Design a protein around this nucleic acid. Structure first.
Ligand SMILES: Cc1cn([C@H]2C[C@H](O)[C@@H](COP(=O)(O)OP(=O)(O)OP(=O)(O)O)O2)c(=O)[nH]c1=O
Ligand SMILES: [Mn+2]
Ligand code: NA
Ligand code: NA
Length: 327
DNA sequence: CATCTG
DNA sequence: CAGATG
């Protein structure tokens, strides 16, 4: 956790570069398991050879470790941080909608900066365009003091649309969190579940209301169950407007709300543990259900859930406030 | 995983 | 449809 930090760090830099700049998925993946296992390792790696002893640890990585340990740097690592092409790709990628793949093509055509992109706004698709337009807004975190206003917003509209809606703002917001990065709304309705063959309106009618009132500003992606978009809190009495915030709405069959709700509420760490325990208690949990584990090796059969309560219970645990859902 | 693109 | 993004 700090005993082999630098090693796991340079390791991740190296790994990440493989995938992003080069295409070395294998290589990339290599650096990863490596950084993974050295992270667990209980000692203070004093040498290459020592590391090597580890699985996932080959001759090449060991080489790297050695040089790093020996000299506070790494040449390859140094050379990579200089390289324009590499830095360019790391940057482009910052734009929502731009992935490494596209990051390469742009750079190859010479688009390396923001200006570059504006100049060639023609080459970008919608998401990408939006991504570019709200570059800055996009990177700003979200003060919960804002979140509450928004949550307040969304909730009132869904309500006015159909009283049977059930909306939940999951995320860190849900877990206390002073600020968040984006707004996750989980949605369900009684009229929608496992078997119930579809109902798009379900999602589209609200999306619509939200835009209606001008909360939703753009659309990144709009499928029949998940909607990716842009939104913003009405600027009061013009002098101080709000940054555009990224939002995500998503349909959930009533019979699988709380699992996802639970789930999405994170944090990863809270999840797994809850997950590992579910296991002991003779169960299973994933993003939509909690099944009773048979013994034959495994089994199934979606247990019925009416609240986040029903799930803890199940695993015979202490119902945890969302706030404390920490780790 | 679900959606967009081309 | 394969392949990209989030
Ligand atoms: C899991 C991790 C999160 O709890 C959730 C997925 O939502 P994300 O938006 O990926 O994460 P988040 O809500 O934790 O982050 P943010 O600070 O951006 O709001 O499921
Ligand atoms: Mn979020
Ligand atoms: Na991006
Ligand atoms: Na292939």
């Amino acid at each position: 956790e700090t005993l082999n930090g630098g090693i796991t760090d340079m390791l991740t830099e190296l790994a990440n570069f493989e995938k992003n700049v080069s295409q070395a998925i294998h290589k990339y993946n290599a650096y990863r398991k490596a950084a993974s296992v050295i992270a667990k390792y209980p000692h203070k790696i004093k040498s290459g050879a020592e590391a090597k002893k580890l699985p996932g640890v080959g001759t090449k990585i060991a080489e790297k470790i050695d040089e790093f340990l020996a000299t506070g740097k790494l040449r390859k690592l140094e050379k990579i941080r200089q390289d324009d092409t590499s830095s360019s790709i790391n940057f482009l990628t910052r734009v929502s909608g731009i992935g490494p793949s596209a990051a390469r093509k742009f750079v190859d055509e010479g688009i390396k900066t923001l200006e570059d992109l504006r100049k060639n706004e023609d080459k970008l698709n919608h998401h990408q365009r939006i991504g570019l337009k709200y570059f800055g807004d996009f990177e700003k975190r979200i003060p919960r003091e804002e979140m509450l206003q928004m949550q307040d917003i969304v909730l009132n509209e869904v309500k006015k649309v159909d009283s049977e809606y059930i909306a939940t703002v999951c995320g860190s917001f849900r877990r206390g969190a002073e600020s968040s990065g984006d707004m996750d709304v989980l949605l369900t309705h009684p009229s929608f579940t496992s078997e119930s063959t579809k109902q798009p309106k379900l999602l589209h009618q609200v999306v619509e209301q939200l835009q209606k009132v001008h909360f939703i500003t753009d659309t990144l992606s709009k499928g029949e169950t998940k909607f990716m978009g842009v939104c913003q809190l009405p600027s009061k009495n013009d002098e101080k407007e709000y940054p555009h915030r990224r939002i995500d709405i998503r349909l959930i069959p009533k019979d699988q709300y709380y699992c996802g709700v639970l789930y999405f509420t994170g944090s990863d760490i809270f999840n797994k543990n809850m997950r590992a325990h579910a296991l002991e208690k003779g169960f299973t949990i994933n993003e939509y259900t909690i099944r009773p584990l048979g013994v034959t090796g495994v089994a199934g059969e979606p247990l019925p859930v009416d609240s986040e309560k029903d799930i803890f219970d199940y695993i015979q645990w202490k119902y945890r406030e969302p706030k404390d859902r920490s780790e």
